[PDB]
Design a protein around this motif. Structure first.
Motif, PDB file in Angstrom:
ATOM      1  N   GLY A  76     -36.743  49.813  32.776  1.00 49.27           N
ATOM      2  CA  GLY A  76     -36.451  48.805  31.768  1.00 49.27           C
ATOM      3  C   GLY A  76     -37.638  47.890  31.598  1.00 49.27           C
ATOM      4  O   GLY A  76     -38.793  48.336  31.715  1.00 49.27           O
ATOM      5  N   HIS A  97     -34.237  43.752  32.329  1.00 50.51           N
ATOM      6  CA  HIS A  97     -33.371  44.181  31.233  1.00 50.51           C
ATOM      7  C   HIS A  97     -33.402  45.701  31.079  1.00 50.51           C
ATOM      8  O   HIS A  97     -34.488  46.319  31.053  1.00 50.51           O
ATOM      9  CB  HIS A  97     -33.859  43.631  29.932  1.00 50.51           C
ATOM     10  CG  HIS A  97     -33.944  42.141  29.876  1.00 50.51           C
ATOM     11  ND1 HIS A  97     -33.113  41.386  29.079  1.00 50.51           N
ATOM     12  CD2 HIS A  97     -34.805  41.273  30.456  1.00 50.51           C
ATOM     13  CE1 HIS A  97     -33.449  40.113  29.181  1.00 50.51           C
ATOM     14  NE2 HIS A  97     -34.466  40.017  30.018  1.00 50.51           N
ATOM     15  N   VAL A  98     -32.223  46.289  30.900  1.00 47.47           N
ATOM     16  CA  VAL A  98     -32.122  47.696  30.518  1.00 47.47           C
ATOM     17  C   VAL A  98     -31.133  47.885  29.377  1.00 47.47           C
ATOM     18  O   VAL A  98     -30.061  47.299  29.379  1.00 47.47           O
ATOM     19  CB  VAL A  98     -31.788  48.585  31.734  1.00 47.47           C
ATOM     20  CG1 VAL A  98     -30.441  48.234  32.324  1.00 47.47           C
ATOM     21  CG2 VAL A  98     -31.844  50.065  31.346  1.00 47.47           C
ATOM     22  N   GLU A  99     -31.511  48.684  28.387  1.00 47.63           N
ATOM     23  CA  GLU A  99     -30.626  48.985  27.254  1.00 47.63           C
ATOM     24  C   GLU A  99     -29.487  49.881  27.738  1.00 47.63           C
ATOM     25  O   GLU A  99     -29.682  50.747  28.602  1.00 47.63           O
ATOM     26  CB  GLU A  99     -31.399  49.637  26.124  1.00 47.63           C
ATOM     27  CG  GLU A  99     -32.470  48.697  25.522  1.00 47.63           C
ATOM     28  CD  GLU A  99     -33.157  49.269  24.314  1.00 47.63           C
ATOM     29  OE1 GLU A  99     -34.220  48.716  23.888  1.00 47.63           O
ATOM     30  OE2 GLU A  99     -32.627  50.275  23.788  1.00 47.63           O
ATOM     31  N   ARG A 132     -29.852  53.482  27.179  1.00 50.31           N
ATOM     32  CA  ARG A 132     -30.843  54.084  28.061  1.00 50.31           C
ATOM     33  C   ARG A 132     -30.345  54.295  29.485  1.00 50.31           C
ATOM     34  O   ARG A 132     -31.068  54.869  30.288  1.00 50.31           O
ATOM     35  CB  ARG A 132     -32.144  53.250  28.055  1.00 50.31           C
ATOM     36  CG  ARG A 132     -32.863  53.217  26.690  1.00 50.31           C
ATOM     37  CD  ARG A 132     -34.085  52.254  26.654  1.00 50.31           C
ATOM     38  NE  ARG A 132     -34.754  52.245  25.344  1.00 50.31           N
ATOM     39  CZ  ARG A 132     -35.638  51.336  24.923  1.00 50.31           C
ATOM     40  NH1 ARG A 132     -35.983  50.311  25.682  1.00 50.31           N
ATOM     41  NH2 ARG A 132     -36.173  51.446  23.713  1.00 50.31           N
TER      42      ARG A 132
HETATM   43 CL   LIG Z   1     -34.641  49.551  28.515  1.00 47.50          CL
END
Ligand SMILES: [Cl-]
Length: 275
Positions: A19, A37-39, A42
């Motif tokens: 991320g 942060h990570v989507e 994803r």
């Molecule tokens: Cl991400």
């Protein structure tokens, strides 16, 4: 409640498969933190908390290892956003990741490599004792606290719960992955972790990893391009045994003659880091 009021966000430290990671400070007490942060889109591996709340597996693993003091960067808090998760993690200051450290300084003196390797072993034992397999042990996932001489393990994003049965999935770093993964897409946790520790130890004392291509990994022929002690060479070669059952246990690594008389973290810093 809002992360934005609770944390002052500073610069981007980096981004990748893990991320995007920012430097931050906790507003209440100025504690240095890392904000990751990570989507959601994803995220590949999902888990759930006792309360049945759906979270990234990374959060589950972090919670398991974050109790008490250890050589693992602890999870302090986490937030769910509509399209992402945000994780608040400890941040050492001043700090340098071990990849950067080796890149800048070259091969480590054996005394320093011993101290660092020992600390990594203790942190990995901690993970395993908490039922967590990291699966991406490598120089870039080790932070050095430059004042305290303490190493801290980061990035559980490829990890799994530790089990005694076979793993048939892997999304860690290929050049640190074992020959049985390359050949068969099968490994067991502890023996694969020991292989990665062999790669890391070689990286520390040689200034670079021993294998680049698949054919080298499965060949497992270890050539030293730097001067390295016979005892160190023996330990590396043992960790990098082709047959997983020929590799040492963690006990056998920490009892090896090369591993005796380890420096304390503070003296490690005084001798090798303060400057
Ligand atoms: Cl991400």
């Amino acid at each position: 409640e809002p992360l934005e009021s609770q944390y002052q966000v500073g610069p981007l430290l980096g981004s990748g498969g893990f991320g995007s990671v920012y430097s931050g400070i906790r507003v209440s007490d100025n504690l240095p933190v890392a904000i990751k942060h990570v989507e959601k889109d994803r995220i590949s591996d999902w888990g759930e908390l006792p309360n049945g709340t759906r979270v990234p597996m990374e959060v589950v693993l972090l919670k398991k290892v974050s109790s008490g003091f250890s050589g693992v960067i602890r999870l302090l808090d986490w937030f769910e956003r509509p399209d992402s998760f945000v994780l608040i993690l400890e941040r050492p200051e001043p700090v340098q990741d071990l990849f950067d450290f080796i890149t800048e300084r070259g091969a480590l003196q054996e005394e320093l490599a011993r101290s660092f390797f020992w600390q990594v072993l203790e942190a990995v034992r901690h993970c395993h004792n908490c039922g967590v397999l990291h699966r991406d042990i490598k120089d870039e996932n080790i932070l050095i606290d430059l004042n305290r001489g303490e190493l801290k393990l980061i990035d559980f994003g490829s990890g799994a719960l530790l089990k005694d049965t076979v793993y048939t999935d892997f999304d860690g770093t290929r050049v640190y992955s074992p020959p049985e993964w390359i050949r068969y897409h099968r490994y067991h946790g502890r023996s694969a972790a020991v292989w990665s520790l062999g790669i890391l130890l070689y990286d520390m004392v040689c200034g670079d990893i021993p294998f680049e291509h698949d054919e080298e990994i499965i060949g497992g022929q270890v050539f030293f391009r730097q001067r390295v002690s016979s005892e160190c060479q023996h330990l590396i070669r043992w960790c990098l045994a082709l047959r997983p059952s020929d590799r040492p246990t963690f006990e056998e690594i920490q009892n090896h003659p090369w591993m005796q008389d380890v420096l304390l973290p503070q003296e490690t810093a005084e001798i090798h880091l303060h400057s």
